[PDB]
Antibody, heavy 234, light 215 residues
Framework: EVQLVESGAEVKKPGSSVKVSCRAS???????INWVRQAPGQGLEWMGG????????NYAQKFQGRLTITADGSTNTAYMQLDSLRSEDTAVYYC?????????????????????????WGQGTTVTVSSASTKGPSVFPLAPSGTAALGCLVKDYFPEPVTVSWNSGALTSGVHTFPAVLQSSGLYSLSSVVTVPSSSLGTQTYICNVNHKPSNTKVDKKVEPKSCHHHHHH | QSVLTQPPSASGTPGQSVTISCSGS????????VNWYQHLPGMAPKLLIY???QRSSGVPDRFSGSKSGTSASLAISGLQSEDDADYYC???????????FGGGTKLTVLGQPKAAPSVTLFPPSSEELQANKATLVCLISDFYPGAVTVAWKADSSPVKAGVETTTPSKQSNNKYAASSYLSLTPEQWKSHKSYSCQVTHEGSTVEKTVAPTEC
């Protein structure tokens, strides 16, 4: 019933601390709110949980002493704070909980009695731990060559993630945003392409909207067919 | 070593069935119910089974869970393309006082129809050229199985330097995509008749070509 929404992407230097929030859309106080992460190329890893009604916290041994989980009932928000960050902490961080109800809630049970299968999940928060500089993208139009392909080249950004929409979200059919490549420079690049009827190239407008949260950068780029006789410069 | 042990991989073809095992101990599976999660690229995990053998709301009855003693199983029948995913078992552990996960099993549904890649190739934009750079962009989509190699040519001559190519990834339609990028100087780009991206899939190579004077 309740939905869980986490805070945005983060980028942190080694040795620093990160805090991720997890806001529920209504009361979510009785059962354990769990935190689970996934590092690149690894399996899901349980970090810990809190039973907000009692404040009781359980942590995986691996994180004891540098992980703190909070539940603020008054705002229906839970938090994860992970200290002394290392490269192995680069991961997607999820909060999650159960949709359980009971005729009678136990007021004095063992902590394990409030842990259940997790069927309510946050959308996940990407945290990157790195000494490298944060850098927003350069965006270039990919002009259309019975369908046509046109797109936007999103070049040289760090870290992940980037999002791309078209016409502020109004255009969704035919959109294919490709996974990024990690280049030899240590920066990422990706492309987003829209397949459109070739016949409508003359009138219809195509603007890609690129968002890179870690650098607080947004780019809008109009994508038009390439003119033969007119080479523009600024 | 995860506390719960799962095989790293399982496979079948469409309409077949599989069973994925999960082995633990007295302190976890021996005394606690088992949960099973499905995990797809890009999205949060999803609960399939709880209380060892109960299906979560909306999950079809071709997924079934069981447990006895200290081992558990997830059985999947009527295999479909969309079942390609990682599957995890989990349990409480009374010695650790916390939740434990298995390492995951990657299920692959093989025997899908072979599909040749679609390729789109873009030249450098005028904007990029004005910034004294040039990137050619080769986008490869809708292929199966999920393996390709990419070669680039200047006119008919192979170009190896300045190439960046992704590993293939599953699309939402369960075919695969990849991309390849070639970095050039503007001078190189303008000095050749054309450049080509050649994509080889299961021994068959197709290509696209672009030229500086196209508009």
């Amino acid at each position: 019933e309740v939905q869980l929404v986490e805070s945005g992407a983060e980028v942190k230097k080694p040795g620093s601390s990160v805090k991720v929030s997890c806001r529920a859309s209504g009361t979510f106080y009785k059962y354990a709110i769990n935190w689970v992460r996934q590092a690149p190329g690894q399996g899901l890893e349980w970090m810990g949980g809190i039973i907000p009604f009692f404040g009781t916290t359980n942590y995986a041994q691996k994180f004891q002493g540098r992980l703190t989980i909070t539940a603020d009932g008054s705002t229906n928000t839970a938090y994860m704070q992970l200290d002394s960050l290392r490269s192995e902490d680069t991961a997607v961080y999820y909060c999650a909980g159960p949709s359980i109800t009971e005729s009678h809630y136990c007021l004095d049970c063992a902590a394990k009695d409030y842990y259940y299968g997790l069927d309510v999940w946050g959308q996940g928060t990407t945290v990157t731990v790195s000494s490298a500089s944060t850098k927003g993208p350069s965006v270039f139009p990919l002009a259309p060559s019975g369908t046509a392909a046109l797109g936007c080249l999103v070049k040289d950004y760090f870290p992940e993630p980037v999002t791309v929409s078209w016409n502020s979200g109004a255009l969704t059919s035919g959109v294919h945003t490709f996974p990024a490549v990690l280049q030899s420079s240590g920066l990422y690049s990706l492309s987003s392409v829209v397949t459109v009827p070739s016949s409508s190239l003359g009138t219809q407008t195509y603007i890609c909207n690129v968002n890179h949260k870690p650098s607080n950068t947004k780019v809008d780029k109009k994508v038009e067919p390439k003119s033969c006789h007119h080479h523009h410069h600024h | 070593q995860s506390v719960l042990t799962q095989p790293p991989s399982a496979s079948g073809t469409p309409g077949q069935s599989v069973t994925i095992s999960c082995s633990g101990s007295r302190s976890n599976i021996g005394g606690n119910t088992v949960n099973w999660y499905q995990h797809l690229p890009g999205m949060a995990p999803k609960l399939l089974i709880y209380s060892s053998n109960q299906r979560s709301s909306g999950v079809p009855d071709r997924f079934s869970g069981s447990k006895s003693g200290t081992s558990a199983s997830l059985a999947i029948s009527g295999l479909q393309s969309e079942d390609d995913a990682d599957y995890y078992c989990a349990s409480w552990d009374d010695s650790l006082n916390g939740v434990v996960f298995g390492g995951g099993t990657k299920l692959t549904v093989l025997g899908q129809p072979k599909a040749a890649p679609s390729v789109t190739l873009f030249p450098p934009s005028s904007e990029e050229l004005q910034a004294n750079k040039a990137t050619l962009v080769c986008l490869i989509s809708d292929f199966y199985p999920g393996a390709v190699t990419v070669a680039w040519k200047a006119d008919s001559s192979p170009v190896k330097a300045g190439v960046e190519t992704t590993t293939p990834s599953k699309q939402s339609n369960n075919k695969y995509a990849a991309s390849s990028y070639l970095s050039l100087t503007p001078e190189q780009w303008k000095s050749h008749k054309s450049y080509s991206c050649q994509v080889t899939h299961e021994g068959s190579t197709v290509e696209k070509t672009v030229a500086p004077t196209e508009c």
